[PDB]
Symmetry: D3
Subunit: 174 residues, 6 copies
């Protein structure tokens, strides 16, 4: 299982690995099968929305909601599921999903020179942050779930949470 075998990053927390589960533009929500590590269909979103970013997890992390720590990587061309990307955290989306702390790192790929000058949350166009928050605010509405979006934190805050999640993993597993 790639979640357990891969390190959290080559230079934590400045550069982490993102293990992508869902490419931008997908309406299918994929997850990793915990037994086998194969990709598994979790569900088809109930609404005609698509993931606005490549979406995945940071290996060897664990979070308050009892899952690996989520990461969103802005890719110009989406990658395939189960692709590793070297990513620089630039911010963090604060949200609760049904009372669980479900925060998500926002990151850019180190190896696309397009994003060389994106280093903090203030470098992202605000319409783009709004569209991401709106997606998570409404994507489970027809399943009757409520999500609360609490805002965006900056790069420093993102990196602190990554360190916290790396420590939580070490506790729970070994």
């Amino acid at each position: 299982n790639p979640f357990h075998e891969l390190e959290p990053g080559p230079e934590v927390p400045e550069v982490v690995y993102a293990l992508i589960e869902i490419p931008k533009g997908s309406r299918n929500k994929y997850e990793l099968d915990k037994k086998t590590g194969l990709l598994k269909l979790d569900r088809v979103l109930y609404s005609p929305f698509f993931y606005p970013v490549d979406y995945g997890i940071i290996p060897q992390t664990w979070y308050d909601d009892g899952d690996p720590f989520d990461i969103m990587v802005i890719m110009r061309e989406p990658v395939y599921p189960l692709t590793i990307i070297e990513a620089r955290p630039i911010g963090i989306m604060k949200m609760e999903d049904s009372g669980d702390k479900d925060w998500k790192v926002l990151a850019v790929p180190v190896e696309d020179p397009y994003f060389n000058d994106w280093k903090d949350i203030s470098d992202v166009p605000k319409a783009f942050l709004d569209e991401i928050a709106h997606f998570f605010q409404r994507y489970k509405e027809l399943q009757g779930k409520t999500t609360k979006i609490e805002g965006w934190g900056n790069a420093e805050e993102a990196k602190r949470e990554i360190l916290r999640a790396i420590e939580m993993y070490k506790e729970k597993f070994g």
Copy 2:
């Protein structure tokens, strides 16, 4: 301008023409330029939603909101903008957009045998009607606009509104 030159349908109101502006899966919202009849970008949706149906207008119609009557055609493979489809109305979505009556016909293509037994609103899976209503409920949320979804009418009601819109066009233009 195709809006003025084409008849409303070969067998109104059982079979109408749909002039498609937006193929299913588009985030770009297109309209017809009224001067030239060329396709024009109206806007990019502010949220990562895609049109869940091929979306267009019925030629030579006019509606209470001061626009051609809208029609949504369920296509398995989306068509290109400015394509004419022969469509059978099977229902109607009732909604208001900023206080304007903005109802939209739901239809299936006559020439796809997949839909041969779809003749009324009750033949559509309810999750699919929900996803369409949810799209129109939220797609302008970040533009600060409010839309109210009032429910779905059946095929007979759709066909009555089509006749009304065909008459309204004749009044206003000639």
Copy 3:
């Protein structure tokens, strides 16, 4: 690790099975699982300009009369990637023979797409869609000189019966 051998046939057999997808809807490339390694392998490029009309794969830990894992076709609105696991509800079975071999294939819908919540048996599928699937398997190997015979469609109960047979066959051959 070979997914075919390592995954259970499903979480609630035969009402819900796992489909391990090999070929997404819309592909002209026909992929298979490499027997030795479990990697995806190109079997062939179809000789005609036809595309797979459904997401196509196998049920893990099954064996059928034709000497292969039992095939399953899953109706997906948006195709998945190869090697994706889908929890699927069987709703019917296509009966066909390919060069003397019984090459029947389960038809299924995904449990986690609410669009298909009411599809529970073969009669819930538009007839034109069943015909398009059957026509595909009737003709897709015509230029390879192969003849296939479509024998018709069986219902959900029959599909479930055959899944149980295939699971038992696997146990006898490998277990």
Copy 4:
């Protein structure tokens, strides 16, 4: 207006003709020119999961024995959009009958794609590719109960002669 009537048959007929594309390679939707309106119109969704193996259209200002514009079928590496004009070199012709009507089709390559610079006649096309095109037309209307008959392929010389005949037929019937 109607591009079918407004555009010349080609800049150097019959060596180079215009192909007015109606259906891009890969489409399961079959489009046709209103022929009175001029705008693209959905004729049908193919009943089988087959896709057009070439970019398909008509030569402007032509008329053929079947009572329609002359079908041309251009090999493109990347498909174009409907209503795009391509300068095309005829390299052959598919002889077929559809419902008894002579429904022959020109096969051509784009002048402005150097990939095909050395394709000049029907013998330059891989045989498997000619077979895939013929098989598509043999079977694409099978579920509609129509019968087509594939009679074989003619060479570039024959295709060019037929183009000139179609140009003459248009003049007699309209001009």
Copy 5:
């Protein structure tokens, strides 16, 4: 009707112009407007495996020093279809010469995508993106034996200046 002649250069020249798109981002096919009819036409297939990095088109009712309509590149997140009109804000201009011809091209953002609300001048564009556009035009005709010289980028004010020049040139040649 020919869109190039019938549409105004824009609703609020030179702050907002119309871009009539001929080539969507991601295309290897290079399309143009047919001079006589206004239909889309394949100009060529690029000789190298490069794709247009931006949606590419022309400003209606303009004429430039190189004897063609003035070209405009629009940065779109999702590409449009050919012959689509986009209201665009010019933010810069690429200066380049193609075989002795001044072939400068306006860079613009769509007015109706809020993603670009803060892009108002050449300095707002990531440098790597400008380089990728320039590299494309530097090399895309290399195998055709053509040499192009990239002279650099001008700012929004310069782009607007040139748009006004191009509008005047059109009036003098056709009006």
Copy 6:
């Protein structure tokens, strides 16, 4: 595990080899095998708007002068997914140097696509296509300031000899 170490070089080397695909035709993303992890990893986004003109990968259990697995580049009509195995016939070899290192690449066609049945050597490939591949490799790292040198193409005989040498080098370095 790591498919690079687990899979044989081919079922009938050097006439038929396995190509383990890392990058599908059309990708601007350059992927590489963790080579220790085994999972697909993004190496870089190409700095220019170029796309891989072929499906690109490596031959398992090979090692080459450049200190990596032997690059193979399979002509597919429909691209495959990363980590797919294709049975491939070598028809030639591209000789090139990258940063001074001998970075030669096998060119191959799939055994199971009848379209390429008559492609057996480098002379069977359209010259424009060989030029497009070479131009891609000549220029794709230009904005990274790297220099590559294209030295030309060898025939099938030469490609096969090099495959055997690479198989031997792997054995010496690992086996």
